[PDB]
């Protein structure tokens, strides 16, 4: 069903939907691991389905249609505590590369493509434990796609070789983020 921002479980899957209050975004939970997002001249939002808690060796499958009209990205997104880390395994993006401004650490090959690895610090920013300072880790896929499988272990292992040691995994979802743009997406996670 179409819902306002919140979190919970739907048809077997955890979901999280958040927006900045701007307006112009419609998020709907669908059958199984499906979610749909339609937006038009939106603000900043993030929505998707997955697991709570996630794991360090989950193989995530996703398929569907991803049609951004401007700034937006499709990625595996989640958090870790001890250390506090916000991470992204970006599979596709619109007009803006989300890693712009982040520091490149290295590269990793996974699921049919090379990914560029970056990291950036967020100081006194909102987080799953409140206002805090933490790193944001990014794996950005070179060959964009809207369906496939992501072996998260390959990314966590590569990040560990670069010095990141994830601790307790919090939620882990396939998410569509939008940033003052328009678009539509219907994604099914499994």
Swiss-Prot record:
Reaction catalysis annotation: Endohydrolysis of (1->4)-beta-D-xylosidic linkages in xylans
Chief subcellular location: secreted
Induction of expression: Induced by D-xylose, dependent on the cellulase and xylanase regulator xyr1. Repressed by glucose through negative regulation by the crabon catabolite repressor cre1.
UniProt: substrate binding residues: 73, 77, 88, 122, 126, 136, 171
Pathway: Glycan degradation; xylan degradation
Biological process (GO), any one: xylan catabolic process
Protein's cellular compartments: Secreted
Enzyme Commission identifier(s): 3.2.1.8
Gene Ontology cellular component terms for the protein in this record: extracellular region
Glycosylation (residues): 38, 61
Keyword list, A-Z: Carbohydrate metabolism, Glycoprotein, Glycosidase, Hydrolase, Polysaccharide degradation, Pyrrolidone carboxylic acid, Secreted, Signal, Xylan degradation
Domain (GH11): residue spans on this chain: 2-189
Activity at various pH: Optimum pH is 4.5-5.5. Stable from pH 3.0 to 8.5 at room temperature and from pH 4.0 to 7.5 at 40 degrees Celsius.
Active site positions: 86 (nucleophile), 177 (proton donor)
GO MF, one example: endo-1,4-beta-xylanase activity
Homology family: Belongs to the glycosyl hydrolase 11 (cellulase G) family.
Role, per record: Glycoside hydrolase involved in the hydrolysis of xylan, a major plant cell wall hemicellulose made up of 1,4-beta-linked D-xylopyranose residues. Catalyzes the endohydrolysis of the main-chain 1,4-beta-glycosidic bonds connecting the xylose subunits yielding various xylooligosaccharides and xylose. The catalysis proceeds by a double-displacement reaction mechanism with a putative covalent glycosyl-enzyme intermediate, with retention of the anomeric configuration. Produces xylobiose and xylose as the main degradation products.
Protein name: Endo-1,4-beta-xylanase 2
Species for this entry: Hypocrea jecorina (strain ATCC 56765 / BCRC 32924 / NRRL 11460 / Rut C-30)
Gene: xyn2
Whole-protein residues included: 35 to 223 of 223
């Amino acid at each position: 069903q179409t819902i306002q921002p919140g979190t919970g479980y739907n048809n077997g899957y955890f979901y999280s939907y958040w927006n900045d209050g701007h307006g112009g975004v419609t998020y709907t939970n669908g059958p199984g691991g499906q979610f749909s997002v339609n937006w038009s001249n939106s603000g900043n939002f993030v929505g998707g389905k997955g697991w709570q808690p996630g794991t360090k060796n989950k193989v995530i499958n996703f398929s569907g249609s991803y049609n951004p009209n401007g700034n937006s990205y499709l990625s595996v997104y989640g958090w870790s505590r001890n250390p506090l880390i916000e991470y992204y395994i970006v599979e596709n993006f619109g007009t803006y590369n989300p890693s712009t401004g982040a520091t490149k650490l290295g590269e990793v090959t996974s699921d049919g493509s090379v990914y560029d690895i970056y990291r950036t610090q967020r100081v006194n920013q909102p987080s799953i434990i409140g206002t805090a300072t933490f790193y944001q880790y990014w794996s950005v896929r070179r060959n964009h796609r809207s369906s496939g499988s992501v072996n998260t272990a390959n990314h966590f292992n590569a990040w560990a070789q670069q010095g990141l040691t994830l601790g307790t995994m919090d939620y882990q979802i396939v998410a569509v983020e939008g940033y003052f743009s328009s678009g539509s997406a219907s994604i099914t996670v499994s």
